[PDB]
Each structure stands twice: as structure tokens, then as C-alpha cells.
Design a protein around this nucleic acid. Sequence first.
RNA 1: AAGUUAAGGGAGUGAAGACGAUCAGAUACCGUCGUAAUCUUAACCAUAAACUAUGCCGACUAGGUGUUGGAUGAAGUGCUUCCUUCAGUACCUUAUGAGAAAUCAAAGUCUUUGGGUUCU
RNA 2: UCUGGUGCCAGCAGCCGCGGUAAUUCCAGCUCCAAUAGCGUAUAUUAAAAUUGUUGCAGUUAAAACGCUCGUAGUUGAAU
Lengths: 72, 224, 28, 149, 76, 129, 195, 95
Amino acid sequence: IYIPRKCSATSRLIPAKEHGAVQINVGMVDANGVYNGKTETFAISGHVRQNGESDACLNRLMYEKKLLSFQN
Amino acid sequence: KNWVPVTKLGRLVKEGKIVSIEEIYLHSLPIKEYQIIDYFFQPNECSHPLKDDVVKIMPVQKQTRAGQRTRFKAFVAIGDGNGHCGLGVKCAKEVATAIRGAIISAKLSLIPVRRGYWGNKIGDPHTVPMKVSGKCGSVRIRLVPAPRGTQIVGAPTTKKMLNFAGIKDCFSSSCGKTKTKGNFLRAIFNALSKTYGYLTPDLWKVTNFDKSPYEEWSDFLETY
Amino acid sequence: SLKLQEEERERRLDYVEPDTLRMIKSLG
Amino acid sequence: RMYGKGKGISSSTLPYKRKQPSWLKQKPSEIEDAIIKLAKKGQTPSQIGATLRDNYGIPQVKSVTGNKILRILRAQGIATTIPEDLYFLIKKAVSMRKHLEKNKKDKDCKFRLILTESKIHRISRYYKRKKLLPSNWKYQSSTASALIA
Amino acid sequence: NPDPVEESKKHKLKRLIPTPNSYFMDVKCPGCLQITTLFSHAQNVVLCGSCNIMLCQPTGGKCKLTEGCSFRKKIE
Amino acid sequence: VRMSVLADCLKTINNAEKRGRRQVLIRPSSKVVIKFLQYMQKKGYIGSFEIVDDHRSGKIVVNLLGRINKCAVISPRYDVKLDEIEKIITSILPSRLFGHLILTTPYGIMDHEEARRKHTGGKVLGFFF
Amino acid sequence: KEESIAKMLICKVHIGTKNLENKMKRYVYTRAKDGVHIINLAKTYEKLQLAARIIVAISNPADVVVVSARPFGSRAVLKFAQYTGAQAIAGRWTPGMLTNQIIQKFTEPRLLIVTDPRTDAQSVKESAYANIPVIALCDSDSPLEHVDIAIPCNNKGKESIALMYWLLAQEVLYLKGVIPRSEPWNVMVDMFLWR
Amino acid sequence: PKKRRNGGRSKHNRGHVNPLRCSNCGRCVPKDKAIKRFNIRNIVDTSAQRDIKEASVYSTFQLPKLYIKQCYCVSCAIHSRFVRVRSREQRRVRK
RNA sequence: AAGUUAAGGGAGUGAAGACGAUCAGAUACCGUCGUAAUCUUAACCAUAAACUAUGCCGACUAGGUGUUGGAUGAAGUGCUUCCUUCAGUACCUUAUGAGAAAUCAAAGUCUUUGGGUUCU
RNA sequence: UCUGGUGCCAGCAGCCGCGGUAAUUCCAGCUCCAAUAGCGUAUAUUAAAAUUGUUGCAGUUAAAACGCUCGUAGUUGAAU
């Protein structure tokens, strides 16, 4: 028994043999502008990137987490 | 045993830096070598064994200019009886070759099965926690939760595969041409796979993403 | 793969469109 | 669409503002007087509202006065005994029947006449289900030519 | 996101909140100094109050209007 | 002809959720669909929805949490006595540990469980799980 | 800063081809009256920083593979890889080295970089067989299937590709401890350009 | 099993199309299904054009052109090799 | 469409038929001719692979290329194109959609089975 | 795929099939299997049959969308 992770975009859980789901790690930046050890994570299920909306989903999530001021 | 490693996941499993197959299940990594399953279910130093079988061997012909070219397609159902099940198919010129290919393919296709309790958290889970439908070809199958004091009411193939998966008890209902044992087994296996992909209300709280094995053993593979 | 391409490697080593101006003036 | 195909969503949508437009300083009494005079001069209420909007600049008479144009037309007692849509359907059926009498080989006109009379019967059934059309009213196809009054 | 949608003018009629595309205006015909109201998407011909002259040509759309005059939207 | 507005609303919500569009527009709002939506909300299957009121039987925009996996109507609205609630739920719901079968009862719209807890089953409306 | 900003205006990255595509509306600024689209380039710069912060998070730089199937992308990807720790695949992509565990090439990554998804689509397909995130240099008409981070650039341009990889390598180096932000660089861009 | 999506013809939003007659066999074939060849050809081959020019005057006489506009049934066109059988996948490609 | 009835028409084609060929035979394919029919009018008949082999109404779900008929806004030159939009009408791709598959933007939103309705 | 007899005959066989000299299927012996003081056979009926389908079928190509439209009974009907 285990708790499968859920796609950060659609909140739909990712099965064992999806093989399309990905983990995205973003490095944080300190004051002078150099990567520090600690990071931040996401998780995108296979269906959304197969459809091709993965980049927009990442943009939205990363704006929510203040990783960038993109929105759209 | 002494299998030379191929993939980085194989390296991790060989040296045992991985803990349980649930980790690779959680991170959805593809299993490319059955030595991983062997290492996770060696007959000794394990709680439960992995028992193989062979459910169907079917001759299959090609009808060349000269003769027939009959090969044999073999289906096997790997199951630990404790939530881990897998189905393997292999076509080969000779029966034992097909058997071995099917065995390794099933071990590669090993999946976790979500067993769901039906009366109480104190009691161990014994049944699919859901009406789960599997489909392959024309045959469709329903697995329905059933009260604990019940066997697997289903076709012989259904019982044989469910007991491998560790489902102690369930209701089965099939439609379509189930005489085609190939996609009968495949539909059963599809339902078992779908058990863990349903988003039951209890899996609603957000859980943090643990470190994937690759980056958290990356420096271990750095010097290799 | 021999030394006959190495020296070749170092030998290899060694207004604007109207929309874009208003574009850049908008951006900063 | 009742017959044939094609959704044809073209229509007119009223504005969100339900009240009289602020710029309009016109008074409902003369609006009703003009509507009465125009109906007396003789026009169906639909085109009455049309010329009211176009030439008098008073959109949505229901906004200017708190009721509908056919409603005030009836309240004055001068509304016609046959509703607009039924009357126009009857007129069209009469015209195409007159044409068919001369050209009985017009199968298409025969088909369209059948459709028009089906519409007439449905509409008249509704109107006499309401009390605003006498119960014995039937629209036999003979006297419809003079039924236009 | 469909609630605060802002640039749905190019959208067809009956948007999130259906609003008609027509409007009303006053026309100051040059040299005539007369006051009258006029409907965009009109269907009839009109005549001025001071001097009897045509103003707009009824067509399938927003009419043709005359060669000149100053026509202003009379929305408050 | 729309016939049942609730059926269209639930079908649209189900399709939007399967697309994972996180926000869905339901055009023909009604008090019945509003009560159904806020019951779904009280059971936590949707976020905060907002009804936009024109003068034309307005619309609804509902926030989706990607958390409902099937919502549907049952037509015709069969009248269900209190006795066969358990007869119909084992046929409709995927399990009796989760899922809700929505009833319209003399005391309002509610699911099967609280219809049991306060007696008086009524007509069936739909379900979601 | 503003000097780096001016550095990328001069090259021709901003111009993107016809075939506007639907998933790049937010990445395109408009179409020129000639009929050729143009990219905001502010989003390009920002998404460039962001992709670099993706890349730097990989502890083992050798687990990043940048691929190219174009003659003038090969030099850029090779030299970008050799500047950073990533390892590149130029020229033809063998269509099995991400799923086949027997062939001698293999070398599966933890991260993939693609110069143009349309031309390198085969690698993009294989990535979805082994959970490779994939970052692609997409232009006005490039498909976005199995693409997670797309920077809006131009893939046809010699100098566009060369400069894009130049800023990518430069920014990951800044993210590393190699160089401070304020120092003016010394490796010059045209060295990335295809002769 | 529906060999072609269009049914072997180009009829849409239409009930009936008037047939023409095959230029080779004369069989009736619907106009949208018939295979039409508008061939623009000279009366004579180049060698005979040279002789016509040299036996002509005005020193600029241009040889007339033939506009023929044949139409063929499926069998006649296939037999005359105006169309090929083609493969299942190549069948979709028209130009 | 064929066919029937009655008037008219009657060029060409042409079920029937008569010849001439081919063939072992050829009452067929081919060629010559040719009656009915084909055409008009007035009546019947009510059937076709009358076929997108896909009943009708409604909602939802995706990009692109066109094209037909309107409407909106702007710009090359009072004139014309582009933009948006409605309604038709096809096509291409895509499906962690469907299907036994061929294939299908509906034949999808179906064992997670119930929008309404008719026929078989 | 034990042993004799028969050899497209006799016969068996619900269905697929077996029988022309090695018959794992007939006729016998031995052995074995199942049920068991019970076990076969025939007919009917129910489940199997989601192959009558309200739950719950199918109708492009497997059987099956009326040639088409109107239309009464019937069935169903926006929001408030």
C-alpha cells in the first residue's frame, strides 16, 4: 500500500505505470542571484502533457508559487 | 543474484539504496529488468512469496507459402497474494521459451492493487474498495465490493487472477466474448490497475512530493 | 578519429522594424 | 426552427437596463397617445413599435410605460380581434392558395401551403386555449379570403 | 477565467452578459441647427425638424447617414 | 428543447471536470441546480461557485477542484420510498463508503444518508462521486 | 541587466514564422503587417532564467541531454554541453536509446533539451516513455506535445539558435558559483555560430 | 467497409447530379464522379510544326491549339492509365 | 427511373424483334436497323444501393485549412482586402474519447450504463 | 495415447468430433474418475440470457433508421 502523488495541475492522481508523468524541480535564488541548495517541486501527470497544455499549467502553477510574474 | 546492472534504477536496486518497490511505484518509473522483482520477492528474507503459473497456451499460425509457421503464445499471471499482481504474454517458436518470456514479462508488468476494507479499519482490507470496470477487446468486467465472508464469485480465470492479486473476496460481472482468454485476463488486469487510480475522497488532502530516487541518489551514481 | 581535425577545430574557433520600436517602448 | 433546418439565432436582445433611459425626458401620456393615434391610422403592433423606435426615439415602450404595447392597445379597446401572427399567417395562406388556384402544378407551393396551414391550426389552437379567440373559431379554408376583415 | 472578462466586445451578441450592439444618437446637420433623435441600425428614413432633408439611408446594418453633420452618441 | 436544465448542467460540469478546466460555465441556472450545486459544495466536491444574474434566467460559474469523478442526473425522477434507498444505492453508487445519491424529499434536497437519518425518502434527482 | 537586455535585441530571435498556432498566443506579441509574427522576448528572457533554474537543480549535470537534428544546431548544442556539464546528442537521433536497454547508446537523462520539437519529435516521444521533463526551444508553429517548459524563440535562425544557447549557458553559469552577476563576460557569442 | 470517405465522388449538400457520357465507352457516369481531363494539345508534333512554319507566311504564324476536354468513366480511365490503383495510405493524397 | 391509361409529339437513343459477326454453341457481349419507351398534357402507380447504408430535437467537448451567404471594425485604391461574428458547407490533424476493427469531431461525453422522443 | 477384438463396418457421439490396422472416443478386460443408496434418460421450466434488456441490449459495415415531410392520440416540456 502507498499513497500515489497527484498532478499539481488537475489534482488527478498518477498511477504506477503512467511513465508520462514528470517531476519538475525549480532552484531557488538568494539575494545576490545564485542558486541555493533548497529547491521547489511540482508534478505533472501524463495526460496533460500528452495533450500539450503542460506549459500553460506550469506557467499558472509557477505564478501561484510566485516563481514568476508571467500569468499569461 | 549476480546480474550485471543495466539501468540506473537497476544499480540502485542491486546495491539496495532503494527501500521498497512502492518507491518506484510512487515515482512511476518503468521497470526494465525482472531482476528488480526477483530482488524484491526472493523466496527467503521475504514476508510473502511470488508464485507463477501459466493460464493459457495457444498455438498461432502464420500460413506461409510452404506451411503454417505455428508459434505458441503463453499467458502467465504473477501474483503475491498481497496487493501485487501482473500479467505477461509471450509468443515464441517453442513452448518453454514462450513460458519464460511470459514469466519475465509478467514480472515486469507487476503492479500494485488497492485492496479496500469494507467493514472496519481494524479488519485488514479484503476487497476492491470500489465498483471497478476493466475493458480489453470486446470483453468488459466489473469487480464489485462484497461483504467479507465471501469467496471470489467469478469465472475460473477471474478467481485465479484475483487470488493472485490478493483480493480475498469480490463480486464479478462480465459482458462480451469472454471465451477469448487473452483479453479476458487483460480486462481483469486493467480493472486491477485502475483500482489505484480513482481518487477516492480519502485521498483528497495534498501530500508533499518526496524526493525521487534519481536525484536523491544522484551523487551515489556520480562516481559511477 | 585522429589528430587531423583538431587543428581544424581551433581554426574554426578563431531603423528597426516599425512594430518592434513601439513594442520595446511598451516593454521598457 | 419549426420547419426545415438551420438554427438561425439572429434576434434582438434587450439591454440590461430595465428602466427608462436617463436622457429620455419624454412623458408616458404622450407616448400612449402617439401609440393610439398610430394604431388608429392603422398598423400592426409590431410595426407600431418599429416606427416608434425609429422615428420617435423611444426604445422599449415597456420601459417608458410600465406595460406592453398590445396591452395598452387592448386597454383602449381598439385592438384587433385576430392576433398579429395569426392574421399574417392567414394572409400568407390566402395569397398562396390564390396563386395555387391558377397554378395547380406548383407542388412546392402546395407543400408550403400545407406547412402554413399546419402553423395556422397550431397557433389558433393556442389562441383559443387562451380566451382571446372565440371557441367556435375554426379557419375553414373557404372564407379565409374575406376573414381578414 | 470567465467572470472578469474585459475585452468581449469582439464577441458575438449574447456574451456573458447579453448587451445589444445598437445605440442612439443626435445628429446636428450642418447649417440646419435642429434637434432630433436617431437609432443606429434603423430601418426607416427620417426627416429633420428644422429643414426637411434626409439623414440616414435604411440598410441591413448601421445605415449610410448623410455626407456631413455631427452625430454624437446620446448615452448618458 | 432543453427539457431538464439540471441534466445539461451536470453533463457540462462532468465534461469540464474530465477536461480539468478548473472553471465551468453553466448557462440555464435554476433554483434546483443551485441547491444541487451547494449540496455538492457542502460535501466538498466543488469550490465556491458564483451565479451571474442577468434579467434572462442567469448563468453560473463554478470553480472545479478536479475532485469529482462523475456527476450525473437520473431521469425520470423516480419516486423512492425509504425502504428501497438501500436497493438503489448499491446499484448506482460505486461504493457505500463514499459517493452520494441525491434525493428531492418533502424536507428539501438531500443525499441518501441524511434522507435515512431524517426519514422520508422522496424522488430521485441524481448522484455524484 | 539592461546591457544583457540590449545584447539580445540585435539578433533576430524575435521574429517567428507564420502558422501562428493556438498554444503560443501568450508567447506571441502580434503578427507584423507583412504577415510574420514576433515574440515578446520579455517572456523569452524570463522563461530563459526559469529554464536555467530548472537545469541547475539537477545535481549531476551529466544527467541532462541536449539534442539537435539541425546542421546549425549541432555546434550550439555541443559547445553549450561542453561549457556546462550536460552531454549532447547532435545529428541523427537513434530512435531507441531512451526505451531500449540493450543498445550501446542508451544514456537516458533526467532532463532533455530540444532545439525544435517538430524536427526532434522522436526524442520528445521517447521522453514520455521514461518520465523525462523536456525543455524545448519552441517557435511560432512548433507543437507543444510532451513539452513542459517552452521558451518562445526562433529555431530556424543560425544566430537565433546560437544566441539562445549562449544565454542559456551563461545564465546557468551565473546560477552556479562560477561567476558573479555583475561581471561582464569574456566568451563571445559568435563562437557558438555555425560556420 | 467503405473504401473511400467520399464514396468515390464529390457530392455534398446535394441530392442528384446530372450524368455525362464517357468519351471512350459512352457509359453514363455522374459528373462529379467522372474523371475529367482538359488536355491542351497541338494539332501536330514539333517536327510537323517546323514544316508548317516553313510552308507558311507572315513569318510569325502561330500553330493553333486543340482544347478537347475529355471525361471518362472509372473503368475507361483505369484501363487508359489516367488514374492508378494506388496504395491504401497513398489513396488519401490528391495533390 | 421503369411501368399503366388517353391525347399529342416522335429527331437521337433504343427493353422487344430482325439481321451480320465471334464462339464448340452465343438466344450475349460487338456492328446495322428497329417497335414500345424516352418528350408534352391530363390521370395512375408509390417503388430504388429512394445511401452520408448514420431518425429528429437539445447540451457539452479541439486545433488548423478553406469555401458560400450576411453583419461589424480598420487599412490599399467614392472603390477593394484584412479583423471579428452569425449561419451553412467540406477537408486535414488530434485524441489518458469511442469502436471488434475498418474507422468516427460523432459512430464521443456508456458496467463511472437514465437529456426528450419515434421507428426497427 | 493400458491390453485384445472390429477396421468407414459395427457402432459411439448433447456439440466439436472418433471409426479405412497403434481406435486415448466403438465392442470388451484391468485400472481410474464423479456422485453415492442413489445414479442416469426424455420432456417442460428457471438461471445461465445484458440472446427480450425498466434496471439493462443492438440498428454505418454483423439482423435492424420508415424515401421524405406534415400531423392527431401518446410521451416529454425554459426560468421565475
